Every structure is written in C-alpha cells, then in structure tokens.
Amino acid sequence: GFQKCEQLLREYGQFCSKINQALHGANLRQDDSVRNLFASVKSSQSSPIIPGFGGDFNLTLLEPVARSAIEDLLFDKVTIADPGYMQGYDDCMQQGPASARDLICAQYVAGYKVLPPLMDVNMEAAYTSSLLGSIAG
Amino acid sequence: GFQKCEQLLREYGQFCSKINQALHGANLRQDDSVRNLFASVKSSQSSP
Amino acid sequence: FSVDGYIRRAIDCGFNDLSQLHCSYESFDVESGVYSVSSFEAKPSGSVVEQAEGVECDFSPLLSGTPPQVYNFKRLVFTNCNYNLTKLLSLFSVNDFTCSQISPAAIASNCYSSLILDYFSYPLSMKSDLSVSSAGPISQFNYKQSFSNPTCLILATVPHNLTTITKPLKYSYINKCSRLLSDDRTEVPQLVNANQYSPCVSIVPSTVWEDGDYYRKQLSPLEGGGWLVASGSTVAMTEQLQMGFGITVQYGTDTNSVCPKLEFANDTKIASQLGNCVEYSLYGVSGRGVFQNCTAVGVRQQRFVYDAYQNLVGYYSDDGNYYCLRACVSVPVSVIYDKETKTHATLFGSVACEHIYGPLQTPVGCVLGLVNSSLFVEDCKLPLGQSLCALPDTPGEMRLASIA
Amino acid sequence: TVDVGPDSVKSACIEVDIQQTFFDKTWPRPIDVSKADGIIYPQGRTYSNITITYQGLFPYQGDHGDMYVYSAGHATGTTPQKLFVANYSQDVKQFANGFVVRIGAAANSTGTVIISPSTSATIRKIYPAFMLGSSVGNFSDGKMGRFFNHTLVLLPDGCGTLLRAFYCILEPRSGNHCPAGNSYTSFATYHTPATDCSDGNYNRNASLNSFKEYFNLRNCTFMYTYNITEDEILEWFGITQTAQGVHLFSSRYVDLYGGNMFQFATLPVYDTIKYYSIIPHSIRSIQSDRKAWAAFYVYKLQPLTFLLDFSVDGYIRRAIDCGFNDLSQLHCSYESFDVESGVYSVSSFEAKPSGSVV
Amino acid sequence: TCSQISPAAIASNCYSSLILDYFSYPLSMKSDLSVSSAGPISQFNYKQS
Amino acid sequence: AMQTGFTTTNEAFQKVQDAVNNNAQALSKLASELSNTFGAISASIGDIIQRLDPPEQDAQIDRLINGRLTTLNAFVAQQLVRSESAALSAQLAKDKV
Amino acid sequence: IQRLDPPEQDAQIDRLINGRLTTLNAFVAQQLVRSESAALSAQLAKDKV
Numbered sequence A: 001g002f003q004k005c006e007q008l009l010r011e012y013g014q015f016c017s018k019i020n021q022a023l024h025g026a027n028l029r030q031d032d033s034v035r036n037l038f039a040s041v042k043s044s045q046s047s048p049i050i051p052g053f054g055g056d057f058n059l060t061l062l063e064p065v066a067r068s069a070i071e072d073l074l075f076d077k078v079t080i081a082d083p084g085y086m087q088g089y090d091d092c093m094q095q096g097p098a099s100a101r102d103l104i105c106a107q108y109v110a111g112y113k114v115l116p117p118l119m120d121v122n123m124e125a126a127y128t129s130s131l132l133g134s135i136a137g
Numbered sequence B: 001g002f003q004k005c006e007q008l009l010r011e012y013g014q015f016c017s018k019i020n021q022a023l024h025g026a027n028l029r030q031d032d033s034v035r036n037l038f039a040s041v042k043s044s045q046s047s048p
Numbered sequence C: 001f002s003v004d005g006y007i008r009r010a011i012d013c014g015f016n017d018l019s020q021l022h023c024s025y026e027s028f029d030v031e032s033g034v035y036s037v038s039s040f041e042a043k044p045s046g047s048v049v050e051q052a053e054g055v056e057c058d059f060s061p062l063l064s065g066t067p068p069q070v071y072n073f074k075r076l077v078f079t080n081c082n083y084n085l086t087k088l089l090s091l092f093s094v095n096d097f098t099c100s101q102i103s104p105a106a107i108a109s110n111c112y113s114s115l116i117l118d119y120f121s122y123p124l125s126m127k128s129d130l131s132v133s134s135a136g137p138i139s140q141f142n143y144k145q146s147f148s149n150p151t152c153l154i155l156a157t158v159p160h161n162l163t164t165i166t167k168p169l170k171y172s173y174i175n176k177c178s179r180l181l182s183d184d185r186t187e188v189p190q191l192v193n194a195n196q197y198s199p200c201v202s203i204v205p206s207t208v209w210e211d212g213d214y215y216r217k218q219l220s221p222l223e224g225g226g227w228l229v230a231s232g233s234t235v236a237m238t239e240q241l242q243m244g245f246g247i248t249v250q251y252g253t254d255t256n257s258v259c260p261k262l263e264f265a266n267d268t269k270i271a272s273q274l275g276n277c278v279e280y281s282l283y284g285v286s287g288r289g290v291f292q293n294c295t296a297v298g299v300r301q302q303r304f305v306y307d308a309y310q311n312l313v314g315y316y317s318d319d320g321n322y323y324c325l326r327a328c329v330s331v332p333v334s335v336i337y338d339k340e341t342k343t344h345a346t347l348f349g350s351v352a353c354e355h356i357y358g359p360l361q362t363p364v365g366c367v368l369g370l371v372n373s374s375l376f377v378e379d380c381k382l383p384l385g386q387s388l389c390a391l392p393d394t395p396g397e398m399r400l401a402s403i404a
Numbered sequence D: 001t002v003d004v005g006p007d008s009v010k011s012a013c014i015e016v017d018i019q020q021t022f023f024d025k026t027w028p029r030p031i032d033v034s035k036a037d038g039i040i041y042p043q044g045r046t047y048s049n050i051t052i053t054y055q056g057l058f059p060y061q062g063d064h065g066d067m068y069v070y071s072a073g074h075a076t077g078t079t080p081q082k083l084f085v086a087n088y089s090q091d092v093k094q095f096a097n098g099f100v101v102r103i104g105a106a107a108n109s110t111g112t113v114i115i116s117p118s119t120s121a122t123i124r125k126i127y128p129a130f131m132l133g134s135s136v137g138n139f140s141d142g143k144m145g146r147f148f149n150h151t152l153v154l155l156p157d158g159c160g161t162l163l164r165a166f167y168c169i170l171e172p173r174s175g176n177h178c179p180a181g182n183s184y185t186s187f188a189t190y191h192t193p194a195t196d197c198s199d200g201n202y203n204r205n206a207s208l209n210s211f212k213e214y215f216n217l218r219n220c221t222f223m224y225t226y227n228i229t230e231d232e233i234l235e236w237f238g239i240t241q242t243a244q245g246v247h248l249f250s251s252r253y254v255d256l257y258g259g260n261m262f263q264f265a266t267l268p269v270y271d272t273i274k275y276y277s278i279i280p281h282s283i284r285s286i287q288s289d290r291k292a293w294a295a296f297y298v299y300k301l302q303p304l305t306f307l308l309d310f311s312v313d314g315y316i317r318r319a320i321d322c323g324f325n326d327l328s329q330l331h332c333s334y335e336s337f338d339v340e341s342g343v344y345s346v347s348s349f350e351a352k353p354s355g356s357v358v
Numbered sequence E: 001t002c003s004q005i006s007p008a009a010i011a012s013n014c015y016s017s018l019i020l021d022y023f024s025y026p027l028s029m030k031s032d033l034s035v036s037s038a039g040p041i042s043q044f045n046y047k048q049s
Numbered sequence F: 001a002m003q004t005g006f007t008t009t010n011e012a013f014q015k016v017q018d019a020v021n022n023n024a025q026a027l028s029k030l031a032s033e034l035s036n037t038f039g040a041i042s043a044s045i046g047d048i049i050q051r052l053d054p055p056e057q058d059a060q061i062d063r064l065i066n067g068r069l070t071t072l073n074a075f076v077a078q079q080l081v082r083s084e085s086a087a088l089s090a091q092l093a094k095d096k097v
Numbered sequence G: 001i002q003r004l005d006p007p008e009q010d011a012q013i014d015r016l017i018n019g020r021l022t023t024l025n026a027f028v029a030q031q032l033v034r035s036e037s038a039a040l041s042a043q044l045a046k047d048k049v
C-alpha cells in the first residue's frame, strides 16, 4: 500500500500483470483438468447403489454413507488446514490464527488467496458413486 | 567460511534451509523411483 | 490513442474492480472469466500512540567543565527519556551538522532504543579528518564513528557567554599508536575501532604536553607482551572552544523509549479504539493493525510479543492490559465478467456479507451483482467454485446457478 | 567523582593463605542447552509458544566452564585467623564477549568444607565477585593480577543481600600483607558472620570494607547497589559489553525458577573490558561454624545460532546449539526439535589452517 | 559540484528545462547546503531536488 | 485389511499427505518471505520511509522490491510446474479409471 | 574484506551473495526439473519392462 514503493515498482514494467496472468492461466488449467477428468470417469449407465451391494462380497466401505466410509476415513486421517471458503476472512478476525505459521489467516495479511475447487464435495462423491455402480456391468 | 558474509546471508531468511530441503526431497524422490521401478522389474519366478 | 493521436476513450484503473481488470490486460476488450483483482484495502480510522513520558534526556554533564580531547571523548548514553536536539544545539554555534544512514528530518523526530552522544574538544581546522573516508590520525587512532548504526556528526563553537564550559590549553590528538612485538622488530599499528577508545589512551595523558611527545608502556604477557607506543600532536587553541559531538542511534535492542516529547491526547489510546484498524506507534514500533483484548502470553517485561515471522502480534500496554494485534486484513475481490453482455459481478471470496439486489451469501463468499435463481446448468462458463456458476441474463444481472 | 565512603584505617591486611590444592576439585556442570542453561533472553522482545532460530551471545553446548569455589578461612575455636583462598587473583582471563555464571548449583547438597576436607556440611549459595578492566599487570612483588586505571568491581555484600558495582581506580595499599607492601600473596575479600550476618541488621559494607583494606578507591565514577532477596535457588548471572556500556543480566528478577537471564542494569563503563579475574573470598567463620559454599561456574559467550523453544509464557526451556554437532545442525535447519528419520547432508567439517606462509 | 549528472554532461546535454535558483549565501555556511546537512539551511530555507 | 491401513507404512496414503504438504509449502513461501530484508535496514517499507530520505530511501525500498519480485517469480514458476505436473497426472488418472 | 571498510565492503559482499544465491536457486530448480523428468521416465521404463 505504499505509494513510494508503487512508484518504484512501475520501473519494472508490467510485473504484476504477468504474475496475475500466469496464475490465472494455471488456475484455469486446473479447472479444465478437473472438468475433463470427471467427464471421463462419468458413466453413461450405472446400477443404483443399495445397501448390500456386493452380495457375498462386502463393499460397505465403498457404499455412500454422500462420501463412502473409506473415503471419509481417508480425508479424516489427513491433516488439512481448512481454507475457509465461505467465511475464512471472518474466522481469522473473530478467532484468529489456529497456530503459529497459519497459512490460511496469512492470506489476508500477505496478500494471497486460496480459491475453491471447480466441484464441491457432494458432486465429486456423486461421480465416484455412480462409477462404483457401473463396475460390475 | 567468512563470518561477515554469513551475517549478511542471514538477511535473506532461511535461504540455505530451503536449498537443502529441496535437494533432500529430490534425492529421496530418486530413491523412491528406483525402489519402485526395481520392485516391478523383479520377477516372481525365473529360470536359472 | 486514435490513429491521429487523440485520446477518445480511457479507463480509470482504480475506479472499480472491472476497471482494474481492463488495466491489467492493457485492453478495453478482455475475455470472459473470473479474475482476481486488488483487494479492498482497509483504511485506518484512527491511531494509537504510546511513548515513555517522563524525564528529559540530560545533557548537563556536557555543559560543565573542560571537554575531553578527541581520544578521551566522553559518552552520554540516553535511554528511557524524552530527547530534544534543539535544546542542545541552541546552546552552540553549529558549524557543521551532517547525518549518515538517517535523514536530517528523522534524527530529530524518530524513537530510538538508545542515543549515544560522544563529545570532545576538536579544532574545526581538522574538520575533514572526522570523515569516514579519512586516513588521517583522527579516524585511525582517535575517534571513529560506527558503520553499522545511523550516526550524525556535529561540529560547533562554544559561544562567549556559555561560561560553564572551560577551555583546555590546546587541542591534542594521537598521531601514532602501535605495538612493538616481543621480537622487537615488527611494529603493528593499533587502529581505533568504531565507538571505542584507542588502546593508547592508557599511555597518552589527558593533554599532550608538546607536539611530538612519545609515550610507551611495557605490556604484560597477558596483554601479549611487547610494548605499546604512541605519539601525540597538538593544535593551538582558538578564540572560542570548538567541539565535536558524535551521535549514534540504535533502533531495536530494547523498547524504543528515547523519543521526542509528545503531548498526548486520550483519542490515541488503545482501549478506546479496540476492534478498529488504526495506525500505531508503540515506543517506536509502528504499523497498521487491529487491537483486541486477550489472554496475556509471552514475557510481560519484554512488552512486545512477536510471532515466527517476526510480526508484532501482541502488546503489553502501560494501561495494564494485554492486547492481540491483528493485521488490517483486506477484503478479497474477484471480478466475474461476461464479454458478450459486458456485465459483471463482484465476488468477495471467503467473506461474510456482513461486511458488504444487495449482497448474496454463497458457499464461496459474498457476491454482489448476482441474483439467486435456483436454476441448474451443466454447461458452465463462469464457475465460482464449489458447484456454483455465474449465468448471464441474455442484458440484465448475472444469475447465480448451481451446476447439476 | 563519587564518594564511596572513607578509606580503611588499618595498617595491615589480613594474611592470605593460598593453597590451590584444596580448591582443585572436579565437580563438572557443563552447559546443557536442552535445559536452556546459560541463555540470555532476546532483549527487545518476547515470543510465545514457537520454535525459532536466534543469533546471539550464548555459551557452547557441553562447555564445562571455569569452576571457582569460596571457602572458610583458618580458625582456632572461636577466633578466626588468616584467610584461605585459591590462586584466583593471579588467574586473569580474557573477557572477549563476556560470560555467564551458574550460581548456587550445589546448594542444599552435602558438600565439603574446603579448608577441612574431612568435614562435610550443607552447601549454601554464595555470590561471585569479579574484577574487570582494560589493562592488567603485576604488583610490586611480581605477582600478577593488578588492574590499571579504571577497574570495574562487582562485589556482592551484606552476606549475599546486595550486589555492589563500582568503577574506580584501585590504588594498592602498602601496609603489611597488602598488594604494595610486604608479605603479599593475594588480595581477598571477606566477611565475619559472627558480626556481619546478624539475623536482623546485616553489615551491608562488610565485603566492601575488606576490599578497601587492600586497595584505596580513587576517582570512582559510580557505585551502584542492587538488592538480592535471600534464597537458595539456582540462579544465573551474566555480563556483556556494548557501546552503551556494560550490561548485567540475571535470572532472579524475571525468571527466578527458570534461569533465563534478563538485563537488570547497565553500567556507564565505556572503556573496553579485556580482562577479568575472580576476586577470592574467604569467610571468617569460627572453626565450629564452617559452612560449605556452592561453587560457581563461569562460561564464556560467543555469537552463536541457537534454536530456542519458547513456552506459552515466553520462557525458554529448551534449546539447540546449532554448531555443536551434525545432529544439532539438522534440527536447526528444520527449525524443529522433531525431525523425520532419514539421511541428511549437513555442513562439512571445515579444515582449519595450522599455520601460514608468506 | 554536480549530483546525478556528470560535470561534463551538465554543460553539454539537452534538457526539457533548466531551472536556476540564485541567492545570496555566505561561503562560511557552504556545508549547510549539503544533502546530508541537518542544519537550518537544508531544513528551513533551501533544499535541492 | 484396508480399513485400518491409513498409517505411516502405507505409501499411497503418505503420498496423499505429501500432496497436501506441497500445497502448504507453496503458501509458506509467500507468507514467510515478507519478513526478509534482503539486505535492507527493515522489511517494513514504512520504517524505511520513516528513517531515510529519497536518495537512500529508494535504494532500501528497491532491495525489498527485488527480493519480493524474486519471490513472486519463484512462486509462479512453481505453481506452473506443479500445475503442469498435476495436469499430466490427471490424464494418468483418467487412463486408470 | 582485505581491501574495503564495512559501508562499501557490505555492498561488494552482497553482490557476491546475490550472485551465488541466484546460482543455487537455478541449480535447485534444474535438479527438481531433472528429477521430475527422470521420475516420469522411470514409470515409462516400468511400463516397457
């Protein structure tokens, strides 16, 4: 925010334009990657998943509880900082940093932002759920 | 080995920590790559 | 610029978020998409100041008796006091006052951990020998200023009516200082370190009797053995005594309690502005942030609590309270832009609408300019994240649609 | 100049018996940086519940330091005789960057009464006395330990209830057993508990007055006193010097039960301290009332990088000396006391010059 | 003396403008026109760009 | 047997945590580099302006600018590398499905 | 250090530091690129075996 620095920063040409455009392009690539991948995992036809799916073969850890039990366990066992997609701005003011070197609250201090993914959790689960129901057939 | 330089080097933050950690990670990746590759070339059965 | 050079169309790059987008691409035509732009900056709504308020810095010793020679300079170290340079300078006829690694405006207005004042008798005719570039007797054997700290050098003449300062018979200095090693063949010059006294000070008397006087001391084995030798030289005394004053200031070895005298108002207190973005100056430590009342952490006696990134994150106030200090966090801004319709909407990612058709709260932050439609799409061109999409009305306002 | 009271009026000093053999003990207490021994707290700030590296003046990990012990003097029944000291006054050390002192570490343990090895007693804390200056040499009889020009003396007094710091010229007295007289061995300070350590009124000038028997105090620029509450708690003391003067550090005013040292005083001593020595102290107790006194340990400081673990309350309880060994280097490079298993490259063992060619 | 321009250049280069500020000034106060000066002249009277 | 398999001996699981850690490292670069002075008297532009006049002030600010520009370039370069890497990897996932 | 005093000495050392820091960053970046490249390539070898 210092005007004196900004004056000097201008002597380096369109530096920030290049930073912003490069990251914008990278972020679009990530969305295209996801859109393309899920378009291909998507089944054209699938059987409904019902409790008991698998018969003698116990697949209850794959059935949606919605995410599956193994899927929830995988996420719960991994240490991930919550980016606060809906209101992280407020959480970091009212509660503050979770710990030392909190890289999520640093967003609004350092001047960077973590963007949300192209798909929410329920949609991603919908794709792997319908994929499960297509395997046998 | 010059103490005067080291004093100035500290003004650049944990520079050497980043260099060392990056190369350490790369070197571990190479060992994981080899271990994985050879695990797969390995035959379960073979003739003498 | 048109072909004929006239300006017919322009963008004010700071007007709004869409304008920022066009300026970053240097174009009046940009593609549809969701773009990050500069955050909405928080501005200070006030300021808080805390300084030591009390005793002034005492320059009295300086004004009484015969000042020392340049190699015997006396040092006054000021901490925990209110300083005023004018109050010292106004007593002398200042011939030269120059600063290094600190502005002239700053030397009289900044807060310091400490201020060190080195004063001595010094002929003005040798002015140049106090320069950092000098290789003469003074910078080599008598007095040298620090290279690492900001310094000022003042040369001034004592007025005829300032009768509390008396004169020496002559000015004197060391023109030689060296050691003769135990072999008695090799002579090693002993140069003075910045802010220190020459090792020959112990053999050279307070006043050199005659120019060319030679001094020697036998050194003990504990001192490396050999001899310490020196020669002195003199300058005839002037009508009015000329003095040098070296000022060295440090900016962060302690609470910066050496400050200008400030008259305080009760609108610059912390307790009265909690929760607000303010500019602060706390014993020389400054910046912008938000103070909150919270549980005391760290050592109380150390006053300032820092995090792992060396930011100030807490402060013990003289009012007895401990405050948490948060940065004046800015509000994220993203432009949702449709090139075909020339319409847009603003997304404030991760922000509740409490800080912003009016604002609409979505799973990715607060949006302004989108209308909730409870409509589904598959063919989304302007994804907002999660499973949200901005859907142009075609023009009207963009609709907020879900991805099916 | 500062008035520091009258000169001693005695024509003679108390004879000092130097028997270093009795003080040649091996009671090692090396710096254990994992307990944050000898650490001077970051001076202008505090931190809470983080681990960071920090550049500052620290003792080396594993440094045994120099051990010094004070003892009871000679006595026959109820009459004290001559003093009994170690050869500390002639043992002049280089000051360098200053030092830290471990004081009272052995307190409460059963130890030996140095003057009488067969006799044991509960160990009590005693404070160290120091003589510091820019120039040293010999006394009239050739013995080393004389300081020239202004000398800084840190002399605890009042049976350990005050620290007196003064910067003055020490002019050796010429009386019997005094440094400029006949039959001189060593100067020493002393107190006589029988008259000086009353339960109520302690003699706050006992060690100063004994010091004055050996030296006249001339051209004193200051004399400061600091109050010490009596206890048997292990404490740390430190001394450093900068352009601002001599900084005195102590744990007892901020971290009494911890050991982190905080600055408590700055002395207007601007000449460079190059040398220091321990002023020997001997307690003139009666033969039947000898105490065992804790040894103190002096450790040198140097500009090192340490990894410092700050507790929620800001105190340093654990640290790493980053240059001690290769494992320490590893923890410092990750700024953590917890690093993963693996094989890590660290700084090479540097070769040092064993000479020079010209 | 010149600053941020060579002595050879000051007399030979082309400029958009040249601004000449003239005044009476004792030579005895020469040093107080220095950029490093913290005396009365650089603080309250005249300062160069 | 897989229900309790998310441990330190599970390489696939650890790779999941590593991917998460790589995201954190990318952000730690931006967050921690702002405390560096890069040879300047302070990491705070406000302090530099507070203490120095323009002919020296510019030099100190310029040190911070070059340091920060370097950091941002390094950050972007790694995001581009990591992004490309992930994009390739997304194709591989497509093939495995 | 042999030739200059601190105010200039720092500037000269700082040039060497920035040059060497740049070199090390470039080195590391290429090792990371070459390492990633080889890792991909190791997978390809796996597939060919």
Ligand SMILES: *[C@@H]1O[C@H](CO)[C@@H](O[C@@H]2O[C@H](CO)[C@@H](O[C@@H]3O[C@H](CO[C@H]4O[C@H](CO)[C@@H](O)[C@H](O)[C@@H]4O[C@H]4O[C@H](CO)[C@@H](O)[C@H](O)[C@@H]4O)[C@@H](O)[C@H](O[C@H]4O[C@H](CO)[C@@H](O)[C@H](O)[C@@H]4O[C@H]4O[C@H](CO)[C@@H](O)[C@H](O)[C@@H]4O)[C@@H]3O)[C@H](O)[C@H]2NC(C)=O)[C@H](O)[C@H]1NC(C)=O
Binding pocket: C084, C085, C086, C087, C090, C260, C261, C262
């Ligand atoms: C840092 O340290 C410096 C140095 O100590 C401080 O600077 C000083 O600040 C004071 C003010 O706080 C300032 O005092 C002012 O002086 C002027 C000058 O008047 C002189 O000449 C006239 C001629 O007619 C004389 O009549 C007058 O007595 C003065 O003469 C002096 O010299 C002669 C020898 O030649 C001596 O014999 C005299 O005794 C004397 O020393 C005054 O005009 C001015 O008066 C106004 O302010 C005072 C405040 O007490 C007030 O009482 C008066 O009634 C008058 O106030 C009215 O007018 C003002 C507008 O000017 C208006 O604002 C008010 O509301 C009233 O309507 C005052 O006495 C002194 O000169 C400064 N000295 C220097 C060297 O700068 C600095 O402040 C310190 N900084 C900090 C942060 O502490």
Ligand SMILES: *[C@@H]1O[C@H](CO)[C@@H](O[C@@H]2O[C@H](CO)[C@@H](O[C@@H]3O[C@H](CO[C@H]4O[C@H](CO)[C@@H](O)[C@H](O)[C@@H]4O)[C@@H](O)[C@H](O[C@H]4O[C@H](CO)[C@@H](O)[C@H](O)[C@@H]4O)[C@@H]3O)[C@H](O)[C@H]2NC(C)=O)[C@H](O)[C@H]1NC(C)=O
Binding pocket: C201, C202, C203, C204, C205, C206, C217, D148, D149
């Ligand atoms: C730092 O500390 C050192 C050590 O104390 C000081 O050095 C000592 O200085 C004193 C003088 O102040 C030396 O003592 C004697 O000085 C005499 C000087 O003569 C002049 O002054 C006397 C009056 O005092 C007049 O009567 C005389 O006419 C002169 O005007 C010497 O003449 C003395 O010599 C005697 O001893 C020598 C042997 O050493 C014999 O050969 C002589 O014949 C005679 O008997 C004597 O030297 C003292 O000796 C110095 N000590 C040392 C170790 O050198 C520093 O001065 C002090 N530094 C500072 C800055 O204060």
Ligand SMILES: *[C@@H]1O[C@H](CO)[C@@H](O[C@@H]2O[C@H](CO)[C@@H](O[C@@H]3O[C@H](CO[C@H]4O[C@H](CO)[C@@H](O)[C@H](O)[C@@H]4O)[C@@H](O)[C@H](O[C@H]4O[C@H](CO)[C@@H](O)[C@H](O)[C@@H]4O)[C@@H]3O)[C@H](O)[C@H]2NC(C)=O)[C@H](O)[C@H]1NC(C)=O
Binding pocket: D104, D105, D106, D107, D108, D231, D232, D233, D234, D256, D257
């Ligand atoms: C020689 O022997 C004496 C005893 O005769 C020892 O002195 C004791 O030393 C211990 C350890 O340092 C002291 O214990 C500490 O006391 C602190 C304050 O005590 C007062 O306040 C508490 C309430 O808070 C009262 O209950 C108590 O009666 C006192 O009025 C505590 O704050 C300390 O706790 C802190 O440190 C510990 C350890 O790290 C943490 O776990 C705690 O959470 C907290 O941070 C601690 O309990 C004791 O008070 C001393 N007694 C006396 C009479 O002095 C000497 O140390 C020993 N000497 C040697 C060399 O061994």
Ligand SMILES: *[C@@H]1O[C@H](CO)[C@@H](O[C@@H]2O[C@H](CO)[C@@H](O[C@@H]3O[C@H](CO)[C@@H](O)[C@H](O[C@H]4O[C@H](CO)[C@@H](O)[C@H](O)[C@@H]4O)[C@@H]3O)[C@H](O)[C@H]2NC(C)=O)[C@H](O)[C@H]1NC(C)=O
Binding pocket: D002, D003, D004, D005, D006, D164, D204, D205, D208, D223, D224, D225
């Ligand atoms: C025990 O040690 C302490 C030091 O910790 C020592 O304290 C000193 O006592 C003397 C008095 O004996 C103090 O000197 C006085 O200071 C006051 C300051 O206001 C002066 O006004 C006094 O001046 C009068 O007395 C002089 C006597 O010499 C006359 O010459 C003069 O004209 C006045 O009539 C006098 O200077 C001294 O300041 C303190 N020093 C400190 C550091 O506190 C105490 O004396 C020692 N006790 C014993 C028994 O040795």
Ligand SMILES: *[C@@H]1O[C@H](CO)[C@@H](O[C@@H]2O[C@H](CO)[C@@H](O[C@@H]3O[C@H](CO)[C@@H](O)[C@H](O)[C@@H]3O)[C@H](O)[C@H]2NC(C)=O)[C@H](O)[C@H]1NC(C)=O
Binding pocket: A058, A059, A060, A061, A069, F003
């Ligand atoms: C299909 O497989 C699942 C496991 O993937 C079987 O469910 C598991 O059944 C066991 C019964 O012994 C449960 O054990 C219990 O755990 C709780 C603690 O959570 C403990 O308090 C109980 O005493 C007991 O030990 C286990 O939790 C449960 N796991 C899950 C994920 O549900 C399921 O029964 C199998 N179905 C068939 C038809 O075989």
Ligand SMILES: Nc1nc(=O)c2nc(CNc3ccc(C(=O)N[C@@H](CCC(=O)O)C(=O)O)cc3)cnc2[nH]1
Binding pocket: D026, D027, D028, D029, D030, D069, D106, D109, D110, D111, D112, D113, D114, D123, D292, D293, D294, D295
């Ligand atoms: N007058 C007096 N003062 C004392 O300080 C004193 N101290 C002791 C006991 N001193 C000590 C000190 C350390 C160890 C000790 O246990 N040292 C370890 C080695 C520690 C290491 O080197 O890491 C050992 O096993 O010997 C024992 C006794 C006995 N009498 C005394 N008597």
Ligand SMILES: *[C@@H]1O[C@H](CO)[C@@H](O[C@@H]2O[C@H](CO)[C@@H](O)[C@H](O)[C@H]2NC(C)=O)[C@H](O)[C@H]1NC(C)=O
Binding pocket: A099, D049, D312
């Ligand atoms: C001091 O720091 C530790 C971390 O070293 C904090 O402990 C963490 O607390 C969070 C939030 O409850 C947990 O999710 C982490 O798993 C904890 N980590 C560890 C290693 O315990 C501790 O809460 C901090 N203390 C204070 C007062 O802030």
Ligand SMILES: *[C@@H]1O[C@H](CO)[C@@H](O[C@@H]2O[C@H](CO)[C@@H](O)[C@H](O)[C@H]2NC(C)=O)[C@H](O)[C@H]1NC(C)=O
Binding pocket: D020, D024, D087, D090, D091
């Ligand atoms: C004072 O006494 C000490 C300790 O006895 C002497 O130092 C010892 O000197 C011998 C050689 O004579 C060495 O082998 C020992 O290792 C030394 N001990 C220590 C702890 O350093 C010292 O030299 C004596 N000083 C004087 C002036 O007599």
Ligand SMILES: *[C@@H]1O[C@H](CO)[C@@H](O[C@@H]2O[C@H](CO)[C@@H](O)[C@H](O)[C@H]2NC(C)=O)[C@H](O)[C@H]1NC(C)=O
Binding pocket: D001, D218, D219
């Ligand atoms: C120490 O203080 C004395 C004054 O108390 C200084 O002055 C000398 O004092 C003695 C004793 O009264 C006189 O015999 C001398 O003639 C005095 N000399 C002078 C020049 O006045 C003495 O100079 C001071 N010493 C130091 C090293 O500063």
Ligand SMILES: *[C@@H]1O[C@H](CO)[C@@H](O[C@@H]2O[C@H](CO)[C@@H](O)[C@H](O)[C@H]2NC(C)=O)[C@H](O)[C@H]1NC(C)=O
Binding pocket: D204, D226, D227
């Ligand atoms: C250091 O301790 C001494 C001794 O307890 C304090 O001096 C006493 O102060 C009280 C209150 O003014 C007097 O009534 C006593 O008569 C004094 N005693 C003596 C022997 O002088 C001294 O004030 C303390 N210093 C500090 C800074 O607390």
Ligand SMILES: CC(=O)N[C@H]1[C@H]([C@H](O)[C@H](O)CO)O[C@@](O)(C(=O)O)C[C@@H]1O
Binding pocket: D019, D022, D073, D074, D075, D076, D084, D114, D115, D116, D117, D118, D287
């Ligand atoms: C240093 C010294 O010589 N100590 C000796 C002492 C003292 O002479 C007496 O304590 C005088 O009070 O006497 C001893 O018999 C003793 O007590 O063990 C022998 C011991 O070696």
Ligand SMILES: *[C@@H]1O[C@H](CO)[C@@H](O)[C@H](O)[C@H]1NC(C)=O
Binding pocket: C159, C160, C161
């Ligand atoms: C000194 O003070 C007197 C008044 O006592 C005054 O007349 C004289 O001009 C003053 N001298 C100087 C140099 O200012």
Ligand SMILES: *[C@@H]1O[C@H](CO)[C@@H](O)[C@H](O)[C@H]1NC(C)=O
Binding pocket: C265, C266
């Ligand atoms: C606050 O300052 C005003 C002057 O602006 C004064 O009148 C008022 O009494 C002060 N109040 C307090 C609580 O200090």
Ligand SMILES: *[C@@H]1O[C@H](CO)[C@@H](O)[C@H](O)[C@H]1NC(C)=O
Binding pocket: C271, C293, C294, C295, C321
């Ligand atoms: C801060 O909170 C404490 C309780 O933890 C309370 O005693 C104190 O008065 C509060 N201070 C302010 C300014 O609200």
Ligand SMILES: *[C@@H]1O[C@H](CO)[C@@H](O)[C@H](O)[C@H]1NC(C)=O
Binding pocket: C360, C361, C362, C363, C372, C373, C374, C400
């Ligand atoms: C839009 O309106 C529907 C109800 O018609 C509601 O369920 C949904 O949450 C709203 N969307 C947003 C972002 O508020």
Ligand SMILES: *[C@@H]1O[C@H](CO)[C@@H](O)[C@H](O)[C@H]1NC(C)=O
Binding pocket: D137, D138, D139, D140, D141, D142, D146
């Ligand atoms: C040191 O000993 C020598 C022995 O010849 C003596 O002449 C000299 O005076 C002594 N030093 C001091 C300060 O007395």
